Design a protein around this nucleic acid. Structure first.
Ligand SMILES: Nc1ccn([C@H]2C[C@H](O)[C@@H](COP(=O)(O)OP(=O)(O)OP(=O)(O)O)O2)c(=O)n1
Ligand SMILES: O=C(Nc1ccn(-c2ccccc2)n1)N[C@H]1CCOc2c(Cl)cccc21
Ligand SMILES: [Ca+2]
Lengths: 934, 352, 349
DNA sequence: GTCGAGTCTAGAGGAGCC
DNA sequence: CGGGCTCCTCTAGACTCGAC
């Protein structure tokens, strides 16, 4: 039969799949290992529990190359990453003639031969290049000038916007507006995603073979720093400290200093591309172009120094092939993007005004406490600045009516000419108290508005104006301690909380800090945080005006908090709208084609490995919020909509780090699966039935599964019991302090224990002389090795094993997906890879083939993880993807309609975006007949 | 009750307490508005026009007769019929491209039998059937935002979804008066029923271009009550003050005069009066008052009238051009040179 | 006939071409006004309001209703005088019992022809009897000047003196239409008859301060037809061209485009359109869509002041073709200088 | 030449993601 | 001892430049 079991009764892979993947002739665990496993499981009360047999899966997988799975992965990655290593070698071997003495003021691409001469060319026509692109920020996002380094000649590029001055330029960019380039081609740069974002041919829907290498990514791969380490490094540049001399920050100057060394690099103090105008660039063309050439030369030197070190400390071809495929992200968009920006900004402005009206009214009403010195009896506003300035100085007939009008106008005009004694800059509201003037915008301000408009909830006078109160005591701000409240009664306490402070010393009252969500060590910045909404509902935090003023203030703050912090990021996204000729025939011929609708693409500015764990970073898309009922502009990802004839076929890995930690601990205990209590708990479950670890935690404590994620992952990586107690009290306000502590004990009682073996294995990898990834064998940054930091930064290094293993998981998934898509001719391409979620822009006709490829990829990756750990087997519980989402827009669930304050009609009504579908393995097999061919 | 006393005392409302019952105001059986009430209503109509007709390429004004003769005549209860009577002729302006609207502010006569006159603002939006719900939602949001952008308490304006006896979709705006909610605006997604009834025969006459397709437009009708909305803003505005919006306060500035010399200060005040009037700013000439009262009494009077600024031209203006400006919102006084008054007053209002 | 055809075709007067009637226009039985006619009448009402109410401290608006509740079964109002007289007493508190003081209103008047509606601007002036004739001549001169101000041929705006049945003095303003002279305004010195009729007994409420003595005023009635004013100005302002005064012409600027690119030119035109609208200049968005001659003829028939054309050249240097309706001449001027030019031109009109 | 109003910088606390 | 990132607004302080 196709059903298999292990000596611990965990159902393993199907017989056919296990035969094709692991081959035959394995080694049994043996008697002693099984006895230890059984004793451990029985002591922890898990042995003998039956589980529902998941159906056996039969697949004729594509013919794997080599003699085992690791050789298969190596051969795939080498074939994928062979020409680009050749291009990098071409970059490493050859040198360059000296930079031209005088650049060229011309449009297009010019080739600099020896002695600085320039020759007009169409494209550089090089397999390998080093790229740096400069953009005039004030003008817009169009590229201004660039320099390309080639093993044979220098290259310079200038846009027609710099060469030619016009009254107006298009604010919506086009492929013809970008830098022309591009069988394989490699382009290197310090932050190459920015340079890639300005290439004309990168915005085509169909993919291109050009790839991009980043020196920040390789810097973090070889010798990076943590955020705390970066802070300490910058503090030092202005117990262990040997890591300082072997690491640097991702600034090109510091990277060049660390890897090449020499005279420090210089940057133009005028900042003619950031703070300057186009005329400054035209006048300062030679200096700016020379600085560009200097930067590209420094990048070339750093790349030459970095490539061998990276290929040594990261020897597996899979890592490089994944980093190559991780920087070709692509996000398709349309006119709904512009509509979304407009609607989000309008809703934000409406809510902002609505919030500011109440604050302006309260401020205006309080100005009357100036009279009679009544402000010193106000419990809230007795501390502000109430001082006043002074003003500073250095029937008549038609003929009779006309004469009277002329005399009146002349008399008025004579007085209007007395400005000689008048200072030129008008004094700001001299007669209004200072606290008022500060809130009132100055007249010259381009965007001026009447009233104390500069007022917001984040300021330090808003709680005093709104007369906010905590349990009947007025709020009060202390610089040393943040926000608090004054409890009257000092006779120079009947209240308990963050305790009396003798530091503040407000006569006749004690001072108590507001209880912060992260303990008595932290300070509260504003009483309008999300944590204080339950306290207002409970009546502890009250507003003086009463009614719904406080609740409405906090609700508006919650609604507009994300857009306030992300509208610069989102509105500034570079969108290149393809014309009709650039689009494929499939999109044009599709029924859902909109002739009056724009179609474009956003290329995320992704740094492939910008983490000590080699996780990618992106300011907008990897921080992009999901659609929520009460968040302005939270439908951001839902605006990433596949073109007509295309769908987004993607999936998210299920319980990734839990499984990686469990499999490590199991391979540490005995060479099988489910050896430990933690691995057995992880394996025995199903996300469809709500019996996975996150769901089980979300049931055992009244927190949600999303919060259970944080709870479990904090428990793994060093969160003590007080942290768990704070999280429980935060996510479940019904829990008291004593009740929250009890559940913290319950979840941390058995941690000889349930999670002992994984802890031991992680400490073993961390304390090793050269810590390396257990699967792909990639070494830790040189600034975290025991020879550098010794025992310090332990939590970072222990979490590094699992997180870098997850990055290896992503690399394996990308390589396998590329192989499967190339082998069977699946018309699709990589869309975006958040940390553990991979999205693929696939054509409509091949969504189910893409789903089958994704499931096969996940199966093969889990088998590779098991093989590298010596287990030589994979359970059926974690074999495949629970649900592969086939959708047109980009959202976590295919069912949500994404109703937000900016989009209250939902995605189905406002736009033509139907709901998608989430499919398991069996549905995919039935749909595609178990084959990836056409 | 205090608000109605102020409104009748400051000539927002006419009559006595007999005809000032809230039922009389809501019905339309009250006597005419006072001059300040007329000015507040006219500013409300101007703002409505600016928001609906001015900054819209597809909207044109329309003229509908107060009576509809033929089968003895009758007065009009709604502006929708007259607007639909102009659909074919106003198709020519937009080159038969939808959406396009017709707008009108007028008085409609309601049976209360007595007749209660209501001033109503109406917009008739001809939209293709495909996007009718989208345009209904857009206009609901736009109108609710318009009502809320002049309100000291925008939460008192609400929208409720509703359905007709034929199942046609629509929305109803409201203002929460102290006693309860009263309807101030209504939107209805009427189909082609009224258009087809009013234009029987060939339907190619009614075809409008939905992009590249000809289609009969669904009639989205928006109808708002300017009298009840004016009373809503009066209640929202209401130390006794009427914090009406700077764009809605009937009189923007009040001009006064200080101590002697009287003759020269009168000339200065008259010149400033002419300047502010030529610059589109309504002025209350308090320098003409003979029964002079104290500064506090004038301040209370101006506050009840919703006077944004009080200009006090004194003898010191004759020597250095300095005038004293008091603001309702802050009750604080400031001195600004006489040359910069028109600029600011135009800036303060336009930026509101 | 040709003028009425142009008005119907260019959306000044609504209805069918044959539905157009001189007598229906003169009596108020016409179906209504097209958008351009509505804007022209609104401009005329604004000019009248600025002339009378805004620039004076004694003239105030009133809100007389359209109906007359109570026994004489109410009826439609026939004149705006009665509402002003009803407002006379309680509005004396506005002027602190000072005389003279006036009430003005532009409303809808219903007269028995069918039923005709005439939009009429009326001013009711309360005068101590000594200076009634002086104020009557003052208002006669000012109103005739206001009517003549916008006219291309202010000789056609005539004035005449008459007396009513009781013999009270009163003038009558007129306009000389092509068929003949038609009444556009009328002044009468009615006296205290109506005031005493509507306020029997207790003359203390009717008194007013005139040099520290109490006086019952004499009403001066100044009543003019704005619809007839609109017709008079259309006839006075007429190559097919409608040379309306800039303070009256409904749409001032026509904004168009040339050849491609369509998107960038449309963006420039939208920016210009919004900039002009932000400063009170009415525009015709003709860029949302023929030969230049046809567009210019259409704009001339619509009383368009200036025509602006945005072409490919505008992107390179900002020059826009500018055309004047009064003088058939074309000039090129920069975009940023167009708004100030239009504002100046309207102010200098 | 002396002081008061713009400008840049840095830190602190909040808020998005996996 | 949660870990890894990202960016924002508000405020205090040092500095710079202009008007009297
Ligand atoms: N607060 C968090 C969130 C995430 N992670 C890490 C651990 C996860 O393995 C990885 C991906 O996070 P997910 O939220 O996707 O967690 P899972 O993929 O395990 O959950 P699911 O089964 O819902 O996909 O990020 C973490 O350490 N702490
Ligand atoms: O809303 C505003 N905005 C601003 C912003 C700067 N301003 C200014 C104006 C002149 C000289 C200095 C400064 N004014 N100011 C109101 C609020 C206080 O009260 C008044 C008064 Cl008494 C008169 C006029 C305006 C106001
Ligand atoms: Ca996941």
């Amino acid at each position: 039969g196709q059903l298999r079991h292990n000596p611990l009764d965990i159902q393993m892979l199907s017989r056919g799949l296990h035969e094709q993947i692991f081959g035959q002739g394995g080694e049994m665990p043996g008697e002693a290992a099984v006895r230890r496993s059984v004793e451990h499981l029985q002591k922890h009360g898990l042995w003998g529990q039956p589980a529902v047999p998941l159906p056996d899966v039969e697949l004729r997988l594509p013919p794997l190359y080599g003699d085992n799975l690791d050789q298969h992965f190596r051969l795939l990655a080498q074939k994928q990453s062979l020409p680009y290593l050749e291009a990098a070698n071409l970059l490493l071997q050859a040198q360059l003639p000296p930079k031209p003495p005088a650049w060229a003021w011309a449009e297009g691409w010019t080739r600099y031969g020896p002695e600085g001469e320039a020759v007009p060319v169409a494209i550089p026509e090089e397999r390998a290049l080093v790229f740096d692109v400069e953009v005039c920020l004030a003008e817009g996002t169009c590229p201004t000038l660039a320099v390309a380094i080639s093993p044979s000649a220098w290259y310079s590029w200038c846009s027609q916007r710099l060469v030619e001055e016009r009254y107006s330029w298009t604010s919506q960019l086009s492929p013809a507006d970008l830098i022309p380039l591009e069988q394989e081609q490699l382009v290197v740069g310090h932050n190459v995603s920015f340079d890639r974002a300005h290439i004309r041919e990168q915005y085509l829907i169909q993919g291109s073979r050009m790839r991009f290498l980043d020196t920040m990514s390789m810097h973090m791969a070889i010798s990076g720093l943590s955020s705390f380490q970066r802070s300490l490094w910058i503090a030092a540049k202005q117990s262990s400290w040997d890591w300082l001399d072997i690491s640097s920050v991702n600034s090109l100057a510091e990277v060049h200093r660390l890897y090449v060394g020499g005279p420090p690099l210089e940057k133009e103090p005028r900042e003619l591309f950031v703070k300057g105008t186009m005329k400054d660039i035209r006048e300062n063309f030679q200096d700016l172009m020379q600085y560009c050439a200097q930067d590209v030369w420094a990048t070339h030197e750093v790349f030459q120094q970095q490539l061998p070190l990276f290929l040594e400390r990261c020897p597996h071809p899979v890592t490089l092939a994944g980093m190559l495929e991780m920087g070709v992200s692509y996000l398709p968009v349309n006119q709904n993007w512009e509509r979304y920006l407009a609607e989000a900004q309008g809703t934000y402005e409406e809510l902002q005004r609505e919030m500011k009206k109440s604050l302006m009214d309260l401020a205006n009403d309080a100005c009357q406490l100036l009279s009679g010195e009544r402000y010193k009896e106000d419990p809230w506003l007795w501390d502000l600045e109430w001082d006043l300035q002074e003003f500073k100085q250095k029937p008549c007939s038609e003929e009779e009516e006309f004469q009277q009008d002329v005399m009146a106008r002349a008399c008025l005009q004579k007085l209007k000419g007395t400005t000689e004694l008048l200072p030129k800059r008008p004094q700001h509201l001299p007669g209004h108290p200072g606290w008022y003037r500060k809130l009132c915008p100055r007249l010259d301000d381009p965007a001026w508005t009447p009233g104390p408009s500069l007022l917001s909830l984040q300021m330090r006078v808003t709680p005093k104006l709104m007369a906010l109160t905590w349990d009947g005591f007025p709020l009060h701000y202390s610089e040393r301690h943040g926000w608090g409240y004054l409890v009257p009664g000092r006779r120079d306490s009947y209240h308990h909380g963050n305790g009396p402070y003798n530091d503040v010393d407000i006569p006749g009252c004690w001072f108590f800090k507001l209880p912060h969500k992260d303990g008595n060590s932290c300070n509260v910045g504003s009483p309008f945080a999300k944590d204080f909404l339950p306290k207002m509902e409970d009546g502890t935090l009250q507003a003086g005006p009463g009614g719904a003023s406080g609740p409405r203030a906090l609700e508006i703050n919650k609604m507009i908090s994300f857009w306030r912090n992300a509208h610069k990021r989102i509105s500034s996204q570079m969108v290149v709208w393809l014309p009709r000729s650039a689009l494929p025939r499939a999109v044009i011929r599709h029924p859902d084609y909109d002739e009056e609708g724009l179609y474009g693409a956003i290329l995320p500015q992704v740094v492939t490995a910008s983490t000590i764990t080699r996780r990618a970073v992106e300011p907008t898309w990897l921080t992009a919020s999901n659609a929520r009922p009460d968040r302005v502009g939270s439908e951001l990802k839902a605006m990433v909509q596949a073109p007509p004839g295309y769908t987004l076929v993607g999936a998210d890995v299920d319980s990734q780090e839990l499984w990686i930690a469990a499999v490590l601990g199991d391979a540490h205990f005995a060479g099988m699966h489910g050896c430990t209590a933690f691995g057995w708990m992880t394996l025995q479950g199903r996300k469809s039935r709500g019996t996975d670890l996150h769901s089980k935690t979300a049931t055992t404590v009244g927190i949600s599964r999303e919060h259970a994620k944080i709870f479990n992952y904090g428990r793994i990586y060093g969160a003590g019991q007080p942290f768990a107690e704070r999280l429980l009290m935060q996510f479940n306000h019904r829990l008291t302090q004593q009740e929250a502590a009890e559940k913290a004990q319950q979840m941390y009682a058995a941690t000889g224990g349930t999670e002992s073996e994984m802890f031991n294995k992680l400490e073993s990898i961390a304390t090793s002389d050269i810590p390396r990834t257990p699967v792909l064998g990639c070494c830790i940054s040189r600034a975290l090795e025991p020879s550098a930091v010794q025992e310090e930064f332990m939590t970072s290094r222990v979490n590094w094993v699992v997180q870098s293993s997850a990055v290896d998981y992503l690399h394996l998934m990308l390589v396998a997906m590329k192989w499967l898509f190339e082998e069977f001719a699946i018309d699709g391409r990589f869309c975006i890879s958040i940390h553990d979620e991979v999205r693929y822009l696939v054509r409509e006709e091949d969504r189910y083939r893409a789903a089958l490829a994704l499931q096969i990829t996940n199966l093969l990756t889990r088998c590779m993880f098991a093989y590298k750990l010596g287990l030589n087997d994979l359970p059926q519980s974690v074999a495949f993807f629970s649900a592969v989402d086939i959708d047109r827009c980009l959202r976590k669930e295919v069912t949500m309609d994404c109703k937000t304050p900016s989009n209250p009609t939902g995605m189905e009504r406002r736009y033509g975006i139907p709901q998608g579908e989430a499919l398991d393995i069996y549905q995919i097999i039935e749909l595609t007949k178990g084959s990836l061919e056409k | 009750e205090a608000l109605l006393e102020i409104c009748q005392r400051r000539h927002f409302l006419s009559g006595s307490k007999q005809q000032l019952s809230r039922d009389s105001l809501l019905s339309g059986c009250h006597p005419g508005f006072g001059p300040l009430g007329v000015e507040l209503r006219k500013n409300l109509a101007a703002e409505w026009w600016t928001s609906v007709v001015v900054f819209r390429e597809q909207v044109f004004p329309v003229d509908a007769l107060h009576h509809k003769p033929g089968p003895s005549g009758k007065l009009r209860e709604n502006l929708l019929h007259g607007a639909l009577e102009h659909y074919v002729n106003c198709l020519d302006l937009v080159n038969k491209r939808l959406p396009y609207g017709l707008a009108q502010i007028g008085v409609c006569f309601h049976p209360v039998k007595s007749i209660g006159e209501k001033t109503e603002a109406s917009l008739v939006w001809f939209t293709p059937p495909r996007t009718s719900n989208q345009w209904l939602d857009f206009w609901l949001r736009h109108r609710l935002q318009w009502w809320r952008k002049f309100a000291m308490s925008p939460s008192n304006f609400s929208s409720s979804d509703c359905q007709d006896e034929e199942g046609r979709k629509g929305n109803k705006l409201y203002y929460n008066f102290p006693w309860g909610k009263e309807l101030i605006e209504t939107l209805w997604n009427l189909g082609d029923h009224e258009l087809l009834h009013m234009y029987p025969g060939n339907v190619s006459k009614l075809h409008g271009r939905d992009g590249r397709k000809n289609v009969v437009p669904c009639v989205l009708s928006v109808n708002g009550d300017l009298d009840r909305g004016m009373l809503a803003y009066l209640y929202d505005s209401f130390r006794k003050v009427l914090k009406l919006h700077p764009c809605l306060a009937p009189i923007k500035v009040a001009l006064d005069v200080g101590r002697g010399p009287t003759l020269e200060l009168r000339q200065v005040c008259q010149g400033l009066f002419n300047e502010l009037l030529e610059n589109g700013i309504s002025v209350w000439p308090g320098y003409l008052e003979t029964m002079q009262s104290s500064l506090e009494q004038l301040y209370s009077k101006y506050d009840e009238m919703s006077i944004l600024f009080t200009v006090l031209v004194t003898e010191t203006t004759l020597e250095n051009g300095l005038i004293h400006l008091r603001s309702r919102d802050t009750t604080m006084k400031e001195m600004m040179h006489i040359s910069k008054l028109k600029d600011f007053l135009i800036k303060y209002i336009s930026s509101a």
